[PDB]
Swiss-Prot record, chains A, B:
Domain of life where this protein originates: Eukaryota
Record bears the keyword rRNA-binding: no
Gene Ontology CC annotation, any one: extracellular exosome
Source species of the chain: Homo sapiens (Human)
Modified residues (3'-nitrotyrosine): Y67, Y208
Phosphoserine PTM sites in chain numbering: S20, S79, S105, S158, S197, S211, S222
Chain positions found as N6-acetyllysine: K13, K155, K193, K237
This protein's name: Triosephosphate isomerase
Binding site residues for substrate: N11, K13
UniProt-recorded Gene Ontology molecular function terms: methylglyoxal synthase activity; protein homodimerization activity; triose-phosphate isomerase activity; ubiquitin protein ligase binding
Covalent link location (Glycyl lysine isopeptide (Lys-Gly) (interchain with G-Cter in SUMO1)): K141
Active-site residues, Swiss-Prot/TrEMBL: H95 (electrophile), E165 (proton acceptor)
Length: 248, 248
């Protein structure tokens, strides 16, 4: 469609009960959301439905992970169809904790992307290097290897978002500084041009994942190829509001 | 001889949406449990709220898995508190599909047994040797190893029931006779005495998690040390009511 609609998704990780959640849902349901922005919220999985009942129709509910088949024997899992049945139109996949605390391989994240997309939930597929890789400067290969694999299982880019998360920027104000962010966002929108199509590159949202704070949010959203944000712990605090009102 | 209350929980797995599941909750509620028995249901994480809201309290809701901390940057995870906030009172932990499809390690399961139990939730903890180890003579080792580390994390054994999954028999091609299910309900009981206390062994339920249908349930509830069932797919059906009444 015309110009890349700004995206701010907030991942609440395994934080919160219904009282803290209920109250945060009150702050959000009453913050001014610009039509500038498309906001999605990942609640913890015991509360995707709670959250969807309570939240305003204008904040999309997102699940934090899902599995590869519609229904099966896999205790502890959720499927896309259940995410859809609860009312959440998105799923967060390939997020770093899955990958590096719980070992989700790229072939699992492929298989998930593909299945989620078959069901008609939007994915935020996550990619990003650790410190040993930025050190070796092999950022290029490990963001690009990663995007080959998500991209190989995307069949219709309309529904997917890419979130660059440099692993080190999770959890400390150790952020990729605005130029750091954009070296790699640009290099990756360019990889999508090389390899997919100009219309995918042109229209795909690449959002920034790492430590977005109410401080950092406007300098960051001024890079040409940073399309919005994946907000970790700041989305749980009221400054989240400010991050929705970032690039204008 | 005991006052071991018959336990029989149903693990729904990653199965169902709110139409079907609501329909089974319906059956399940017009059903009548015996006074000697304790029924628990295990919903897909997404529906632990939906299910507790529709189900009769004479049936307890249970989560199918939880993490070892109260709250954290564990995208994908739910914590004992999140479960308890939904009104659910049991976690199924150390289940084979986690331990084998999802790499859950023994140390990490025990750290969740200690922690789910710290939060006042009860725990059905699962153990079982795969085909290879049934055959290699090794049953013993694996099952003992596994109970051991659950036992190194249980302060109060009233809050736990042990479940033998004959993992060697499911999918494989081989099959467990009720008699051969019982001999490992005897070994594990005999482990509880020699290793912890007899005060535990005469008190802890040791429930079977093999193939239990309406047909097999009587021939297996008859065995001495088979205190109940963690039922798979038979549980998504009205047959569960026949399994519940297997001791009548």
């Amino acid at each position: 469609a015309p110009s890349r609609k700004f995206f701010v998704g907030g991942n609440w990780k395994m934080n919160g009960r219904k009282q803290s959640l209920g109250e945060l849902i009150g702050t959000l349901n009453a913050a001014k959301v610009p039509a500038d922005t498309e906001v999605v919220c990942a609640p913890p999985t015991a509360y995707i439905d709670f959250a969807r009942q309570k939240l305003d129709p204008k904040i999309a509910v997102a699940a934090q992970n899902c599995y590869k088949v519609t229904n099966g024997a896999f205790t502890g899992e959720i499927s896309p169809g259940m995410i859809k049945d609860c009312g959440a139109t998105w799923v967060v996949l390939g997020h770093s904790e899955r990958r590096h605390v719980f070992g989700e391989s790229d072939e699992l994240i492929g298989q998930k992307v593909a299945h989620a997309l078959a069901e008609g939930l939007g994915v935020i597929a996550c990619i990003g290097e650790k410190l040993d890789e930025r050190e070796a400067g092999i950022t290029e290969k490990v963001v690009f290897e990663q995007t080959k694999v998500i991209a190989d299982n995307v069949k219709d880019w309309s529904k997917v978002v890419l979130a660059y998360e440099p692993v080190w920027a999770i959890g400390t104000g150790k952020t990729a500084t605005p130029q750091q962010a954009q070296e790699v966002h640009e290099k990756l929108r360019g990889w999508l041009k090389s390899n997919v199509s100009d219309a995918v590159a042109q229209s795909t949202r690449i959002i920034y994942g790492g430590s977005v704070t109410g401080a950092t949010c406007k300098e960051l959203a001024s890079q040409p190829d940073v399309d919005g944000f994946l907000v970790g712990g700041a989305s749980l605090k009221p400054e989240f509001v400010d991050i929705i009102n970032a690039k204008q």
